[PDB]
Amino acid sequence: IALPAFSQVDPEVFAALPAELQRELKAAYDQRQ
For the chain, which residues make up each domain, given as ranges? 1-33
Q: How many beta carbons lie within 10 A of that of residue 14, not counting itself?
A: 14
Widest Cα–Cα separation across the chain: 26
Which of 9, 5, 11, 10 shows the shortest CA–CA distance to 24? 5
Q: How many beta carbons lie within 10 A of that of residue 31, not counting itself?
A: 8
Contact status, residue 5 vs residue 22, Cβ threshold 8 Å: no
Q: How determined?
A: NMR
* 14 Cβ contact list (under 8 Å, min separation 6): 22
Q: What amino acid is encoded at 9 in this protein?
A: V
What share of residues in the chain are helix, strand, coil (percent, to 5)?
65, 0, 35
